[PDB]
Amino acid sequence: NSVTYNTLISGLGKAGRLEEALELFEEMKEKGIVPDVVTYNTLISGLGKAGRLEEALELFEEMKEKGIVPDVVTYTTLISGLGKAGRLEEALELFEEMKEKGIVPNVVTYTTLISGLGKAGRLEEALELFEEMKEKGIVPDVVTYTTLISGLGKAGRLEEALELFEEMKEKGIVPDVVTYTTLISGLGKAGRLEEALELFEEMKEKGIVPDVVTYNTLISGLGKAGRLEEALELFEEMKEKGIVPDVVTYNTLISGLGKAGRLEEALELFEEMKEKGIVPDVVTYTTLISGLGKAGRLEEALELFEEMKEKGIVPNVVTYTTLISGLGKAGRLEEALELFEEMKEKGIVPDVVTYTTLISGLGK
DNA sequence: TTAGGGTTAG
């Protein structure tokens, strides 16, 4: 029964049925049968990817207590989850713990830390870790390079991101659609959309086929350069090439339309995505709430905020800030303050944007 | 057989 139950949970986890996997896991522990490390790693990954990091860390504690020894996969998964949640110090603490326990980190472990460091803007530390990895005889692959290229591009260090891309090719590491898309994004964000479009052409000529993420990146870049009509033309064509738009495609176009004040069309796409089975998320609702509030349609923005909660979508700091900005600009400071208090009550931490927005409203 | 990279909102 131990092997059958473990294969089942590991199977369900692989199939993305986390709650069903968790159920059989509890059921196997009720019947006193011991879960294996693959089962624990699968559940820890699922929980981490669902944002349920405290539950992931609880399972990590549970396997240690039950005498199930964490391996490189266990630590790498948790380091990934902690890093994605901006909990860099804890991710690094876990990396120091695995090393003290004689568990050998590999290229995946190091790439995961490089990613978490780069996302927290600690790019120099990511560059130093990349040098450290090489000194230990760990060979970076296409994923490791792409990770750093992304960190560099996000800090607007495009000349260094392209230098690293050239170094990578010089070492015989072949770029894939992800490497090219990363650069297309970086270029597009640094006001170099034309270079990004030339690189997209050079990518295709090298036999690299774009995926939906490549298209979403081009759509984003076009919109930012005041070329929303070309973004919409690319989307209206995207379907013909067989590429299926996803939640991000819709979120990006909704943002572009909403920023241009073309709110009716943004809402048309919101209805179109729902008809096509594409499920709106926190980004979809927050983008529309911002579009509505900025166009003076504050009551609609507040009603959409109610709708979002009713659909089980959890508002974040971005959602609260856009409404605080909306309420503040309309002179509804009492409501903006209550919302600032409600957000704090839900454990949502304000950032500099939240503070400066609220001060601007109260200061008028 | 579980773990790493690219896209979107204030």
Author numbering: 4 to 367
Report text from the authors:
PPRs stack on each other to form an extended solenoid structure that can recognise RNA in a sequence-specific manner based on the identities of amino acids at positions 5 and 35 of each repeat. To bypass these limitations, we previously used consensus design to engineer artificial PPR domains (cPPRs) that are highly soluble and, via an appropriate choice of amino acids at position 5 and 35, can be designed to bind RNA in a predictable, sequence-specific manner. In this study we have discovered that cPPRs bind not only RNA but also ssDNA in a modular and programmable manner, analogous to their RNA-binding capability.
Although these proteins are highly similar in their primary sequences, only cPPR-Telo1 gave reproducible and diffracting crystals. We solved the structure of cPPR-Telo1 and cPPR-Telo1 bound to its ssDNA target using single-wavelength anomalous dispersion at 2.1 and 2.0 Å resolution, respectively (with sample electron densities in Supplementary Fig. 8). Our structures provide the first pair of structures where an identical PPR protein compacts upon binding a nucleic acid in the canonical, sequence-specific mode, providing an opportunity to understand how the conformation of the protein changes upon ligand binding. cPPR-Telo1 wraps around the ssDNA upon binding, inducing a massive compaction of the superhelical structure and decreasing the length of the protein from 104 to 64 Å. To allow the separation, an extensive hydrogen bond network between an arginine at position 16 and a glutamic acid at position 19 from one PPR repeat and a glutamic acid at position 18 from the preceding repeat in the apo protein rearranges at three out of nine possible positions leading to a more open arrangement when bound to DNA. Specifically, the side chains of Glu128, Glu198 and Glu303 form hydrogen bonds to their own main chain instead of to Arg125, Arg195 and Arg300, respectively. An identical mode of thymine recognition is seen in our structure when ssDNA is bound and the methyl group at position C5 that distinguishes uracil and thymine is orientated away from the protein, such that it is initially hard to predict why poly(T) ssDNA is bound much less efficiently than poly(U) RNA, based on this difference. Support for this hypothesis comes from the observation that although the electron density is very clear for all nucleotides, it is weaker for one of the thymines (T7) in the structure.
